[PDB]
Write a protein that binds this ligand. Sequence first.
Ligand SMILES: CCCCCCCC/C=C\CCCCCCCC(=O)O
Ligand code: NA
Length: 278
Amino acid sequence: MTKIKIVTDSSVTIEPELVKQLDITIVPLSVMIDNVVYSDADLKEEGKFLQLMQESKNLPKTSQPPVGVFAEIFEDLCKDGGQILAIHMSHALSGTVEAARQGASLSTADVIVVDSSFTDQALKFQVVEAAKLAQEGKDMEAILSHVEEVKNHTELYIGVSTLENLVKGGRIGRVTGLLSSLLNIRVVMQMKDHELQPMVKGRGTKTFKKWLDELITSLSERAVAEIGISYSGSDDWAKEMKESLQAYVEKPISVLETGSIIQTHTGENAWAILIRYH
Ligand SMILES: CCCCCCCC/C=C\CCCCCCCC(=O)O
Ligand code: NA
């Protein structure tokens, strides 16, 4: 057969050892910082991108991987005679997945391309479950079906402390019915069917804590398989959320600094709660 090979993009937020252990291939996005282009692959060191974005003259600008890079990576991976499954961030956030579709079509490899409908650790849940099944030698049908199951049992919540990065990066366009006369405000959103749906907005310092208490109430009678927490800036608030959420899931919670691609659009002092239910 040769086992199926899993591909994703560098919007995935994941422990780096897990990438190697499950033979996942990560296609890097890039980001321009004061007119200098960096590969996302060189911005994974804790706090490194944060510090560049804090000091850069210009707001950074993110870029999807080229069609051609996807085609070239798919060609090298299929030399073993295997199929490829590429799982990518939402088409609503990035052209990445369309680039993978074009790349697949240009390559001679047998390549299936799936839109995760998410990013960050929610994309991680799909990718990791795909790679686990791949390495057990499951076929493409079985992998796709289980990955869909993971997706359909996943929720993504995000909190931002400013809207300026979302406005300047354009992804404010995917936020449905948010009215704010202020950019410097705290907002919690749910990413649902490729839209960012606002759940609450507030200037005050308890906006996130109050929202969290409502989340925890709702988790009373859910069976939770995994919780991941991601953050930009310092991890203080993320660690506090972990303390209250860990009681609700057996598996230890991964608390991870999000990547440069997401930090560019969220700004500092953002966070995410990624939940996969049984
Ligand atoms: C703080 C961690 C947040 C994790 C959840 C992110 C949810 C989606 C919201 C904002 C990020 C948007 C990222 C857009 C990247 C585009 C890349 C490109 O094609 O240039
Ligand atoms: Na092909």
